[PDB]
Amino acid sequence: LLRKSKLKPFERDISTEIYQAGNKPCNGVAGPNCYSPLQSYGFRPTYGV
Amino acid sequence: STIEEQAKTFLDKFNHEAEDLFYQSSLASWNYNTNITEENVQNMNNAGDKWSAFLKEQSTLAQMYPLQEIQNLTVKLQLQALQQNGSSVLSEDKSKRLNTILNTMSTIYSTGKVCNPDNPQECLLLEPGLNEIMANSLDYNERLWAWESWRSEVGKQLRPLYEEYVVLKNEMARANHYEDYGDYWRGDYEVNGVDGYDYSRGQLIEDVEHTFEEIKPLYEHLHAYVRAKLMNAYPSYISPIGCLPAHLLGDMWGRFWTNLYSLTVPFGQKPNIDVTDAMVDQAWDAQRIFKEAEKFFVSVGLPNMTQGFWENSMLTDPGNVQKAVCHPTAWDLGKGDFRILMCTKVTMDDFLTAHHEMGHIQYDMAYAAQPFLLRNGANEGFHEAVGEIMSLSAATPKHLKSIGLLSPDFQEDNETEINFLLKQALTIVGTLPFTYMLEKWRWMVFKGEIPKDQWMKKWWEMKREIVGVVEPVPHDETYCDPASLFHVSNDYSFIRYYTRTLYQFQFQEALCQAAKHEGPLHKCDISNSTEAGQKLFNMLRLGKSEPWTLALENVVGAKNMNVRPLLNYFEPLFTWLKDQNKNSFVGWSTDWSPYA
Numbered sequence: 325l326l327r328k329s330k331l332k333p334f335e336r337d338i339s340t341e342i343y344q345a346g347n348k349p350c351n352g353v354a355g356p357n358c359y360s361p362l363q364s365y366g367f368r369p370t371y372g373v
Numbered sequence: 374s375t376i377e378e379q380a381k382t383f384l385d386k387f388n389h390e391a392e393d394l395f396y397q398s399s400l401a402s403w404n405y406n407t408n409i410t411e412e413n414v415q416n417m418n419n420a421g422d423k424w425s426a427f428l429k430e431q432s433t434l435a436q437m438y439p440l441q442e443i444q445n446l447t448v449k450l451q452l453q454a455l456q457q458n459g460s461s462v463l464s465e466d467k468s469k470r471l472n473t474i475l476n477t478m479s480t481i482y483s484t485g486k487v488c489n490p491d492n493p494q495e496c497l498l499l500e501p502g503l504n505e506i507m508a509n510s511l512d513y514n515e516r517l518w519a520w521e522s523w524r525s526e527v528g529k530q531l532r533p534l535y536e537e538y539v540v541l542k543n544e545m546a547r548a549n550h551y552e553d554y555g556d557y558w559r560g561d562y563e564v565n566g567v568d569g570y571d572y573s574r575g576q577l578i579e580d581v582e583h584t585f586e587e588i589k590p591l592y593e594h595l596h597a598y599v600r601a602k603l604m605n606a607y608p609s610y611i612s613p614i615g616c617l618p619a620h621l622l623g624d625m626w627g628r629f630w631t632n633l634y635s636l637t638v639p640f641g642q643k644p645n646i647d648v649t650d651a652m653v654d655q656a657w658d659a660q661r662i663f664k665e666a667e668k669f670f671v672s673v674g675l676p677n678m679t680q681g682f683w684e685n686s687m688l689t690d691p692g693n694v695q696k697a698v699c700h701p702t703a704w705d706l707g708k709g710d711f712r713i714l715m716c717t718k719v720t721m722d723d724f725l726t727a728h729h730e731m732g733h734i735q736y737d738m739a740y741a742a743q744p745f746l747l748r749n750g751a752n753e754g755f756h757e758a759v760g761e762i763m764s765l766s767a768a769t770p771k772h773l774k775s776i777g778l779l780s781p782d783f784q785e786d787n788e789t790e791i792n793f794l795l796k797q798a799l800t801i802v803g804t805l806p807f808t809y810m811l812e813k814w815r816w817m818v819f820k821g822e823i824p825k826d827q828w829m830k831k832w833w834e835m836k837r838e839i840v841g842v843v844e845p846v847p848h849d850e851t852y853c854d855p856a857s858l859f860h861v862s863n864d865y866s867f868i869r870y871y872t873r874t875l876y877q878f879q880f881q882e883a884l885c886q887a888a889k890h891e892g893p894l895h896k897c898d899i900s901n902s903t904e905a906g907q908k909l910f911n912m913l914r915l916g917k918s919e920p921w922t923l924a925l926e927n928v929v930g931a932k933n934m935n936v937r938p939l940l941n942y943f944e945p946l947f948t949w950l951k952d953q954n955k956n957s958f959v960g961w962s963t964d965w966s967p968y969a
């Protein structure tokens with residue numbers, strides 16, 4: 325849910341990294357002004373349609 | 374790269390992060406609220422603690438991105454909502470102390486001991502009991518005894534804590550950028566950054582006092598009428614001219630004057646409109662009435678709700694094998710989950726409360742498209758007005774006859790309309806002066822215009838004048854008279870009921886104008902027009918996306934709250950009451966002191 329350069333048709337990018345949303349270098353732990361992509365879903369049987 | 378994009382990224386991550394935790398906490402609370410057991414309490418406690426910790430961590434994180442840098446208004450609203458809730462700007466030994474004070478107050482309110490006239494066998498509680506006694510008991514001595522005893526129990530017990538509690542609350546209000554607790558509470562009705570629609574926190578008091586001064590005459594006429602009715606009901610206790618005893622009227626606190634209908638019924642020889650008798654003939658049940666309410670909602674032009682509502686609802690008493698707190702609530706657990714918890718007993722008031730709760734359920738379904746921080750509706754008076762207008766427009770004789778419960782022979786007569794209007798006014802207009810006076814007293818206490826040594830006297834002074842009632846037993850600075858109420862000891866705002874009524878009637882009028890219907894609006898039958906449904910839905914799906922003034926203009930075409938629709942509704946009762954008080958003075962004398 326967080327990645328630039330919208331995918332070209334029929335390509336797959338399995339590349340987990342640390343998003344650089346901000347203006348500072350970011351290595352390892354995201355912390356402030358830095359995020360991590362690939363958020364999960366969650367699923368329960370009582371969920372609405 | 375800019376501040377706005379960073380804020381947008383933070384918000385779009387925060388929404389998806391918080392939805393799961395909110396759903397878990399709500400589900401745990403719902404599971405406890407029908408299967409009461411200690412493990413469910415532990416689950417609720419830990420889930421709520423986790424949710425609060427996550428919320429406070431996010432609030433601390435969101436301190437960056439200064440508000441004058443962000444231009445988008447929706448981002449500003451979301452950031453303000455995130456920053457306000459969960460803030461813990463206070464020194465140590467005060468937050469935990471305040472929590473202890475609050476929970477001790479809640480526990481002491483939930484456990485009241487009068488123990489009868491020194492009878493060790495029974496100690497009455499606020500369950501069916503002394504409140505049930507005040508509901509219907511024609512005995513001056515017993516009513517006075519209970520009335521004084523309850524306040525003596527929750528008087529000096531809770532009086533000293535209130536001073537330090539309000540001191541701490543005012544200290545917290547000073548700590549953050551505000552004026553006082555009254556200003557903090559009034560800050561909800563605020564609009565900024567938009568011209569023509571900006572609403573400040575100072576105009577609310579002016580509007581409230583203007584509306585009350587416009588309302589006054591009808592209330593005073595009804596007060597004269599009910600004084601006369603009590604005079605031929607209660608002899609030798611009501612002064613010819615003056616105030617009224619507090620314990621005699623209505624409920625324990627006198628908020629709702631509903632129980633006086635039997636003693637104050639005018640020309641009530643005709644059978645009551647209530648149709649609870651005919652329900653057993655068709656063997657009605659909860660499913661039937663809920664389906665009928667769903668059919669009405671669909672006929673208005675709104676969708677019916679999902680099968681999950683029918684699957685996971687609790688619309689029947691579970692029996693003695695389960696421990697459930699029976700009270701009508703409309704839970705919206707999120708992620709497309711909606712369910713109502715309420716017991717039913719096949720009665721007319723149950724039929725009305727079904728519509729009342731279904732209105733809230735539909736409103737919750739309406740705004741489920743806005744982001745998480747704006748999902749909650751507009752100014753908190755809307756969420757009750759929308760649920761109350763549909764109950765208002767569902768008890769009319771026309772709708773009952775169309776449904777079939779009413780026999781197709783009961784024609785409408787002047788006296789039936791008078792009885793219905795008086796029954797409505799006994800609960801609709803009666804509570805306005807009480808709410809206004811209580812909120813005004815709390816505002817003055819919060820501001821500090823009333824010194825502590827001047828408490829307990831200026832409050833009763835307000836009661837002897839604004840409402841027109843007098844204490845039967847003199848009270849001194851040892852008691853806290855405005856402390857026996859549920860909302861005072863639980864730290865809840867009380868103005869939400871003053872703006873609930875006016876708004877509601879306005880909506881009704883506008884809706885009853887969309888569907889062409891002549892005659893008095895007190896008998897309106899909005900059940901088939903699709904234009905009114907569109908008018909409601911064009912504002913329902915908004916939440917906190919636009920200022921409430923814009924929504925009000927959208928629904929009715931005005932710019933703020935107005936009182937004309939209420940008087941338009943109650944005009945026939947006003948005329949009949951004016952024609953009735955041909956030989957009785959209207960008003961009261963504050964100088965009367967029956968206690969002496």
Ligand SMILES: *[C@@H]1O[C@H](CO)[C@@H](O[C@@H]2O[C@H](CO)[C@@H](O[C@@H]3O[C@H](CO[C@H]4O[C@H](CO)[C@@H](O)[C@H](O)[C@@H]4O)[C@@H](O)[C@H](O[C@H]4O[C@H](CO)[C@@H](O)[C@H](O)[C@@H]4O)[C@@H]3O)[C@H](O)[C@H]2NC(C)=O)[C@H](O)[C@H]1NC(C)=O
Pocket residue numbers: 458700701702703704730733749757864865866
């Ligand atoms: C940011 O923080 C603020 C304050 O901390 C939150 O504001 C709260 O909002 C909720 C949602 O409305 C308020 O909850 C309301 O409480 C009312 C009081 O009910 C109490 O008393 C009854 C018994 O009479 C108890 O059963 C109940 O549990 C409460 O203890 C209710 O009357 C309200 O219910 C209304 O709607 C339902 C439908 O859902 C109807 O069935 C009811 O009849 C009624 O009309 C409602 O539940 C709460 O009071 C607010 N807090 C304060 C301090 O005012 C914000 O929600 C929060 N923002 C977030 C979390 O995003």
Ligand SMILES: *[C@@H]1O[C@H](CO)[C@@H](O[C@@H]2O[C@H](CO)[C@@H](O[C@@H]3O[C@H](CO)[C@@H](O)[C@H](O)[C@@H]3O)[C@H](O)[C@H]2NC(C)=O)[C@H](O)[C@H]1NC(C)=O
Pocket residue numbers: 445446447448
């Ligand atoms: C303030 O920020 C919000 C959030 O980004 C802005 O609202 C966004 O407005 C755009 C249109 O300008 C919406 O894009 C829409 O996307 C759907 C996707 O299917 C597309 O079908 C539509 O045609 C449209 O392009 C976007 O969804 C919307 N964001 C949200 C959360 O609803 C808003 O415009 C900003 N304020 C100002 C003044 O621009």
Ligand SMILES: *[C@@H]1O[C@H](CO)[C@@H](O[C@@H]2O[C@H](CO)[C@@H](O)[C@H](O)[C@H]2NC(C)=O)[C@H](O)[C@H]1NC(C)=O
Pocket residue numbers: 408410412
């Ligand atoms: C009410 O709560 C009790 C206590 O948790 C539930 O009983 C448990 O049920 C689960 C299955 O759902 C079992 O695994 C546990 O062993 C049971 N524990 C006890 C102490 O009985 C009960 O099922 C709940 N009733 C509901 C949810 O209707």
Ligand SMILES: *[C@@H]1O[C@H](CO)[C@@H](O[C@@H]2O[C@H](CO)[C@@H](O)[C@H](O)[C@H]2NC(C)=O)[C@H](O)[C@H]1NC(C)=O
Pocket residue numbers: 672775898900901
């Ligand atoms: C709104 O629509 C309903 C549904 O058509 C109307 O209910 C009908 O009323 C007539 C008149 O007695 C009955 O013959 C029908 O059997 C009713 N329909 C159903 C499905 O029961 C209702 O009268 C309409 N209301 C208004 C004000 O027009």
Ligand SMILES: *[C@@H]1O[C@H](CO)[C@@H](O)[C@H](O)[C@H]1NC(C)=O
Pocket residue numbers: 671675676677
């Ligand atoms: C309401 O329920 C009935 C019966 O299931 C269904 O036929 C109708 O389509 C529903 N209304 C809407 C708006 O879906």
Ligand SMILES: *[C@@H]1O[C@H](CO)[C@@H](O)[C@H](O)[C@H]1NC(C)=O
Pocket residue numbers: 786787788949
């Ligand atoms: C109401 O109507 C009745 C006849 O239906 C009439 O006698 C009476 O004067 C009218 N006005 C009232 C009761 O105020």
